[PDB]
Amino acid sequence: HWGYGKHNGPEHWHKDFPIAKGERQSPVDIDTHTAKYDPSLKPLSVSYDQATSLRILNNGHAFNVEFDDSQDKAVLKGGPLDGTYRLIQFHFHWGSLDGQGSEHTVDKKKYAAELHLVHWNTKYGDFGKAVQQPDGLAVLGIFLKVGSAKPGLQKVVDVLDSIKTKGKSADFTNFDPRGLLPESLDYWTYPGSLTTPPLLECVTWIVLKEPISVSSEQVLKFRKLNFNGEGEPEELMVDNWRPAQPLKNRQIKASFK
């Protein structure tokens, strides 16, 4: 099955998932000079005060912090979005070295990692239905650079020892995703896809301009995770990012000048 190795990584995905070569694939390089300031964009609204985290799961390609999305407790709206999108999970993509790991790039620069907060459009009633729609998801992307610690990430880092291998889950309640956000909500936005199979073209990407900084120890702990299940041969969960895909017939919009 698909993965990030030599024989099953991104360049192979198209064989099972032909949309890999589609017209609105993600991620992309964000050419900051070619992005268009868009005045019709409304302010972005991130309402996470009532978020209910439930669990953390190693799914064999990343770890997801999952939320209760059975009510409007943690929602994204505004910006380029019509309507209300509920937070279902967040996860990261990261590198084996600090010089790579992000999926999106900014003027070809790679960050050490990238946080994805995955939301679905409440008009479609659940995540499974939403991913089948062209406006089904909104993913808020935040770049991580290595420097000072991010205190708000530490609770995540500390539980990773409990979900080292594929299939492991652990209770993860009362985590506040507001501690992972940078000061500024300035963003680029464009229409794209899931960056993991099934690669469905259902995502409005909202990528924040301002990275968060995390410590070297914090990202090191990500790199101790395993793609494999317990008792299978150990392969460190690193470089779980898809490279930048062709922009094709798309223009990236910016909320700022």
Specify binding-site residues for substrate. Answer: 195-196
- Using the minimum distance from each CB to Zn ion, give the nearer residue, 66 or 249: 66
- Which residue's structure tokens are 């459009």? 121
Nearer of residues 116 and 221 to Zn ion, judged by Cβ = 116
Decide: 114 and 92 in contact? Cβ < 8 Å.
Answer: yes
Known binding-site residues equal 91, 93, 116, 195-196
Query: 12 an active-site residue?
Result: no
Contact between 221 and Zn ion by CB under 5 A: the answer reads no
Q: Which amino acid is at 253?
A: K
User: Does residue 105 sit in helix, strand or coil?
Assistant: strand
Using CA atoms, how far apart are residues 70 and 87, in angstroms rounded to an integer?
A: 10
Length of the chain: 257
Cβ(189)–Cβ(255) under 8 Å?
yes
Site string for Zn ion, 84-123 (x = CB under 5 A): --------------------------------x-------
Shortest Cβ distance from residue 83 to Zn ion (Å)?
A: 22
How far are the Cα atoms of 6, 164, 213, 223 from residue 238, in angstroms, in the given order? 13, 13, 19, 6
- The mark string for 186-215 relative to Zn ion (x by CB under 5 A, - otherwise) is ------------------------------
Catalytic: which of 1, 12, 14, 61? 61
For Zn ion, the binding residues (CB under 5 A) are 116
Residues marked active site are found at 61
